[PDB]
């Protein structure tokens, strides 16, 4: 127990906020509420884990320091560094089983747990390694995040698939009712490799993307994934199951194409959803020549009706849908025009941007 370091407040603030992501509410193990601080080679390493996934932030030290390591409560420490005045010099060191944080006339004594008892993830070796812009990964995750399943018994659906095929990187997420898929080129001839990143890991990976001009170094291993963006290294265990094939889920011959304004279509569904069933959220779609009629009913016998002028080429058909699943798609599509590919009343519809096909969404109907 020897480490000491002196860092300026602003140089610790973003890293502390960053590594405190995996850490939530009240944690299962006491050590999982602490951050591993590690002074070495002239750099400070802040680590925050939940067993499953970890986040490491490397901070360059300017003031004299001494190497060593310990873990300190995350929420307290950050609330201390943030509470300090702008431009404060934070001087940190050990005290038997305490950490002494001093800055001006402010002095804090935090209870520490040994560094040796911090879950530094099981040694692993990478298989697929590639680099791509932060904005690319952000789009890929952002456009499919919502379709993941929360606590489905089918563990493999509570996560996002990260599949590399040729020059593209693809993300696909589904819950058994909806599916979202997005694929974008990253200027590299990649091997065919598909891995399932857990739901919580996906969120923390997206949150670490500030949107900057820096590259992102992704390392996919046997049972782990790693992402390097700037001075942050995110690592996460992969979900162990066989993810369903998105290609089999996509409609084979959806011949009835409907085109309409994304916002006008979103507003109609949002208004119809008001008088829909609060639990089941059922709305039925009537597609007529250049017309769409959305009808919603609830147990109180209240009815909403929305008629829209669409660009509809095809036969008249009726289809029931979970308006929340449909609105989720319309909000993910931040575009001007949308295209809907209707197969029939009991088959899925493919909704995608009328301008771009990088992202496609499949929503299964309900029998009304």
């Amino acid at each position: 127990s020897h480490m000491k370091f002196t860092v300026e407040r602003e140089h610790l603030l973003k890293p502390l906020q960053q590594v405190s992501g995996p850490l939530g509410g009240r944690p299962t193990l006491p050590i999982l509420g602490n951050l591993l601080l590690q002074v070495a080679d002239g750099t400070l390493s802040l680590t925050g884990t939940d067993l499953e996934m970890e986040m490491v932030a490397r901070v360059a030290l300017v003031q004299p320091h001494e190497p060593g390591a310990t873990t300190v409560p995350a929420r307290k420490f950050f609330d201390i560094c943030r509470g300090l005045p702008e431009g404060a010099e934070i001087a940190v060191q050990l005290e038997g089983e305490r950490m002494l944080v001093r800055s001006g006339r402010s002095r804090f004594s935090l209870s520490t747990l040994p560094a040796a008892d911090f879950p530094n993830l099981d040694d692993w070796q990478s298989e697929v390694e590639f680099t791509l812009p932060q904005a690319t990964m952000k789009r890929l995750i952002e456009a499919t995040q919502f379709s993941m399943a929360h606590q489905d018994v089918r563990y493999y659906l509570n996560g996002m698939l990260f599949e590399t095929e040729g020059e593209e990187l693809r993300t696909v997420a589904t819950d058994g009712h909806r599916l979202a898929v997005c694929s974008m080129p990253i200027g590299q001839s990649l091997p065919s490799h598909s891995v399932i990143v857990p739901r919580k890991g996906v969120i923390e990976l997206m949150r670490m993307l500030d949107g900057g001009d820096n590259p992102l170094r992704v390392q996919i291993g046997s049972n782990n994934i790693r992402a390097h963006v700037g001075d942050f290294i995110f690592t996460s265990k992969l979900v162990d199951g066989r993810f369903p094939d998105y290609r089999r889920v996509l409609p084979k011959n959806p011949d009835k194409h409907l085109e309409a304004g994304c916002d006008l279509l979103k507003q109609a569904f949002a208004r119809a959803a008001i008088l829909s069933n609060e639990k089941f959220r059922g709305v039925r779609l009537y597609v007529s020549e250049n017309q769409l009629k959305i009808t919603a009913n609830n147990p109180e016998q209240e009815e909403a009706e929305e008629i829209l002028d669409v660009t509809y080429s095809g036969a008249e058909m009726e289809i029931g849908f979970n308006v929340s699943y449909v609105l989720d798609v319309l909000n993910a599509l931040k575009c001007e025009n949308v295209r809907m590919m209707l197969t029939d009343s009991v088959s899925s519809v493919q909704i995608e941007d009328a301008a771009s096909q990088s992202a496609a969404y499949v929503v299964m109907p309900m029998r009304l």
Binding site: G176, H177, R178, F280, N322, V346, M364, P365, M366, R367
Partner: peptide, 6 residues
């Protein structure tokens, strides 16, 4: 009701 995609 709701149908499966699969």
């Amino acid at each position: 009701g709701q149908a499966x995609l699969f």
